[PDB]
Amino acid sequence: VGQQYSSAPLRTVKEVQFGLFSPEEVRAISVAKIRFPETMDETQTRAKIGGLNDPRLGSIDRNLKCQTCQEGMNECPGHFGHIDLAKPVFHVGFIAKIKKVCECVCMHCGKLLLDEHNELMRQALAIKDSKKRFAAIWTLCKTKMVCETDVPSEDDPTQLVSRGGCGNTQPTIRKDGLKLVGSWKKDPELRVLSTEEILNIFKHISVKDFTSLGFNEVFSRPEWMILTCLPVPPPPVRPSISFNESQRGEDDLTFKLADILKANISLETLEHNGAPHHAIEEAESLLQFHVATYMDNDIAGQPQALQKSGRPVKSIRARLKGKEGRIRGNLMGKRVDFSARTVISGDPNLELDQVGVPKSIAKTLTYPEVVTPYNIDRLTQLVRNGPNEHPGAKYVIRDSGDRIDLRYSKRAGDIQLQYGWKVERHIMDNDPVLFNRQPSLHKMSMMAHRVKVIPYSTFRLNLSVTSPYNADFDGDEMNLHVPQSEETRAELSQLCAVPLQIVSPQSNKPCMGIVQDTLCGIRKLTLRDTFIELDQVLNMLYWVPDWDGVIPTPAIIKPKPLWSGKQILSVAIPNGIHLQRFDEGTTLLSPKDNGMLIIDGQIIFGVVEKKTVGSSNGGLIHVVTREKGPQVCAKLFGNIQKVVNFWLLHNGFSTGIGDTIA
């Protein structure tokens, strides 16, 4: 059914601007204030208002609408909530940056310790990129342990000029877990710097000051690095799974948000009802730890938040990183529809650009063909055939976007197709499909073939195409992919087609060649002793599909009409092809029959071997695909394979234990 029509303009994302939420923006975009750690109500059957699964945040049930946008599961993107923290906390991924900014700026008035009055500071401000400039400023100002309310003049060090400083001694700041401790210089007294103090000092940092530190005035202020209003992700981010559709197991993020809410309520009650400063610090440390492990559970030197079963809580950072994260496992690569996988098998009777697709796979995979006057009759016949018969169709998509399954519709009568409708019909012969073998190291390991629907359960493919795929038939499996639009179908067959990838750009030589039985039989066929009698010659000539119908004059007329193997293999070679290769000891007479001479597509001398029809530069494949084109070279592959495989079928080739005996 797709998604409902929207009157908003359809645009593409041209720029992505990064930054940090203001605490004001979290409350501004929030649709609810989360106040209760519970998710279910007091009847354990509706969602609690103000809880973690508040209906204003969105719905993750197919039968429940969102309270805010009044849309279903597939349309509502989810809406954010917010938690007002009792005390501000550090962001766990910004602790080192907070510490560096703390070393940069004053801990008493919130001003940069070194200004343009210093020579080494001025060149640090002249650095264009923010990261290198901030690193230079931090390395220069980490050793300055005084605000320097009075500094020597730049023009001459004879008179003293007073900047806007307090002159206080900046403590050495070091981290011990989730908190920062400062030790003032002894005339060292160590004390823990509270997060509210750091937030207040970061609020006093001027616009020109943190811009020199690399912080944008609009998008990322240093004061926004301190968390005082925690955003609450919608239930689409943290769905409640079901083990047997009777348990209500929640996500790990829901558990962490419940713990954060419990710590926040505990801190609020301790502050409101009075508590010793040890208890307040302990509660705010617990809240800081819960927020940190909610954003990052794997912290060096910290305990890990654990589930009830003892497994570590999967934080958001764990959900993003790795090959199973959102980036690498869900965005850079992903599982896709309209794809198939089975064992591959060889087929010498297929073309180079053909894949033998199983009939069940063909009946499962579909292509949506738009109804035109050119295919109204064929698509009507495919709709009448139905989904249980190949060729047929499985769905009819109307112009309104409604999709009619062709199952549960024959009882409703026939469907009259209109122009512009789509028919999701089974993939038929000569449909361009992408065909791929993992690991897929190079581009020739994923190429476009044409479908030939076959009555067995394996993918069938030509033997010459196994070398670019690095594919065997000892149980190898290869993926199929079906394009779903005319653009992808067209650029699949005009860029990714198998004949177009015959010559590899990796080594400027062909990557597809005559291999295995065809190579052995093409060496045995083109020996001087190999003479073929008339009946077998006619059967060979008919096996070449583009044979022009003229029987070549035999190499021996009398006393018996005998054709040589070179003569019949030359029928597969197109006319106008000239090849000349001299091996060791090769002259115009070839006593060893080595080398190669092909004139006008006719083999003059030379046994045809890996140097001629293999994947080698200057071979027959390279010359034919450079002179005649890729389609003619694919036809050459097919013709050579057919004629040589027929000859080796009626000749035979073996190997045995006696071949290993000297």
């Binding site: 059957t45 060889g346 067995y456 033997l463 065997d472 038939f473 291999v515 295995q516």
Partner: protein, 196 residues
């Protein structure tokens, strides 16, 4: 038979060459979550059970279990189980007061089929009734089935030929299997030849 493929004789396959039995056992237990939330092995009906699977339930008996010997096909229910729900809800449109239960039945695998070989009813350690249903089928060798010698010479069936299409000796003996010569020299599997 190129690139580790092998040509198997179809006539040999018809006489039982490499034909195998395949058994698959399905286990299911009725667990008591509490007082009213308990599972029951029963044959569900469309009138009073919600979220029924689209596969057939007609092969089940009164206990929700299929008798041994009955042929099963893909996505067919072999163990029938239902769990109670909260009455008078509003979900999926097709929810009424008659729907006091939902279906928690165990269907067969979507591609598998066969014959129910043995159905075993017993109790676990907790005393809850649980069942095991064994389904038996033939695996007849076809194109793509993997076969190996005793020497690391693995490969799938490229094609099957009948006896009259296979090569034959002067004694009328045809192979059950044709493997490629090119699997021999690079792998240096001399012991395959000496074994033959």
């Amino acid at each position: 038979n190129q690139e580790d493929s092998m040509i198997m004789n179809q006539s040999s396959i018809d006489r039982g060459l490499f034909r195998s039995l395949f058994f698959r056992s399905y286990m299911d237990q009725e667990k008591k979550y509490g007082m009213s939330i308990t599972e029951t092995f029963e044959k569900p009906q469309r009138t009073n059970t919600l979220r029924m699977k689209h596969g057939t339930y007609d092969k089940l008996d009164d206990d929700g279990l299929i008798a041994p010997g009955v042929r099963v096909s893909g996505e067919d229910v072999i163990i029938g189980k239902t769990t109670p729900i909260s009455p008078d809800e509003e979900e999926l449109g097709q929810r009424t007061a008659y729907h006091s239960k939902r279906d928690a039945s165990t269907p067969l695998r979507s591609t598998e089929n066969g014959i129910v070989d043995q159905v075993l009813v017993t109790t676990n350690q907790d005393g809850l009734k649980f069942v095991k249903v064994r389904v038996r089928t033939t695996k007849i060798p076809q194109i793509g089935d993997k076969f190996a010698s005793r020497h690391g010479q693995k490969g799938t069936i490229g094609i099957t030929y009948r006896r009259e299409d296979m090569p034959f000796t002067a004694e009328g003996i045809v192979p059950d299997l044709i493997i490629n010569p090119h699997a021999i020299p690079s792998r240096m599997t001399v012991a395959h030849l000496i074994e033959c």
